[PDB]
Amino acid sequence: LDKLIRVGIILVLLIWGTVLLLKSIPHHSNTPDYQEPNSNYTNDGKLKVSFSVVRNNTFHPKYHELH
Amino acid sequence: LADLGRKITSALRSLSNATIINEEVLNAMLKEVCTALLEADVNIKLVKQLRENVKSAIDLEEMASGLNKRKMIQHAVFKELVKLVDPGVKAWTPTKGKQNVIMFVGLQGSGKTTTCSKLAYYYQRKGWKTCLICADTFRAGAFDQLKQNATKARIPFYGSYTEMDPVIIASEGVEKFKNENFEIIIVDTSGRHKQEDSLFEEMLQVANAIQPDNIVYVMDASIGQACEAQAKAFKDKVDVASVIVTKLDGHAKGGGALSAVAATKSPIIFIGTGEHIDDFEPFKTQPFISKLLGMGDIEGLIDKVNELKLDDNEALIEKLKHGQFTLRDMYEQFQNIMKMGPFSQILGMIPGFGTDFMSKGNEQESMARLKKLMTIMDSMNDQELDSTDGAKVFSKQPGRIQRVARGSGVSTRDVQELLTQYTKFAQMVKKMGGIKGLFKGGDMSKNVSQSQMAKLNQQMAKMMDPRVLHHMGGMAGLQSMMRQFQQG
């Protein structure tokens, strides 16, 4: 019976708290994977900065020859 | 009743959750709604009337396909029940600042003596000034019972052991209490049956001598077919405008009340399912039917919370965010729990698991057991109550436990158990403060993100209890119910 009374108390406390404190709350939207997707996107950005750099012809303004 | 609603609620679930809904399903589901009504002592002709009333209210023959059938089929029966229980005449409500006198009538053993105390205590709690009048001279020791119940309810009362005429004592009690400007004056009348003409005329004599503002007839829920004959006869003589149903815990579940409503065209103001005075519940029309369909009242619970009317909500929030949870705050929360009213009604009004979950056998004394918590905590001084954490200070000087046990009983194990509960609540509050921004005030963060709400939901689901979270509806169900409390 003690467990049941504890459950009742918890439920009433939660209801009171929400009514007098918490703000707007989303119903359910398949709670974002962002908690680990932060590190996943950190690795993804490490991949993104690893994009291939195209080769280029090095400029060199040389002088004249010889005669 | 908490049993008819389940049967009726299961009948609506039989109609739903089906790959198809034709004209055969309706009848099939209507049979379950009829059998339940028959078990509720309602007349078979009336049942055959509700079945025909819902049949014409929802015709699938030429029903515009594309419109929610189940939605308008479950609402067709909800209106039927409500109508079946609503008389259609507005009830009488006493006015502020005016002396309102209510006279109670009923049969012997209906509970009029307890009904007086229940109504008086309800009005006193709501803030009304009330007094009691005992005009019973036939039942042996009726005045003694009324006197002991009144002094238990700290409500003024009047009476006399030697006076035999109820008319003079009732009239003089009303005259005495009108001098001091009492607002509500309820007069207790002795039991009476229509077969006895002497008390029948005594009722008219006392009614003319007192001239009550409203006449209330007390009807037990355990009576059978004999209710209509006495009710109509009583109404034919005195101006009965409202009735009260008692003994709701009985097996007969007050099946004749529907026929009584159909006869007198008057509503029921309150219902009492317990012998104790504190067991007193309203009989609001729409919420009672909404309970039967698993659509529990939300307006009533928020109205009760508004009646709780917490003084401040800003300093408490900043205290919670910093992780402080003191003993005095816990004592105040317990005081709000006690002032919240009956514990069964709190979870009865939710659309959750159901209303037949709070058993009167054990939780009634469990509330009195919880009452010992304030007794234990009243031995704490200002330093302990305002301390940041009671476990740390209580772990340093054991003599404070002895001092607490001085004021209270043994409490050697009770104080330790209370400290464990306080430690668990303190850790819960620390986690709630560590959610980092789920509360109002401060910044203009009116909308809460789904990630922080998901973290809070995970934290909440891990500490309440098993076997109640699964049937609650899961994370989605809990969040949807919290949103319902938000909008509602």
Ligand SMILES: Nc1nc2c(ncn2[C@@H]2O[C@H](COP(=O)(O)OP(=O)(O)O)[C@@H](O)[C@H]2O)c(=O)[nH]1
């Ligand atoms: N089960 C149950 N019994 C009740 C309730 N209210 C009153 N009673 C019973 O009614 C009895 C008192 O009836 P009483 O006031 O003397 O009726 P009266 O003689 O007509 O005035 C008590 O013994 C209670 O057991 C209730 O809500 N539930």
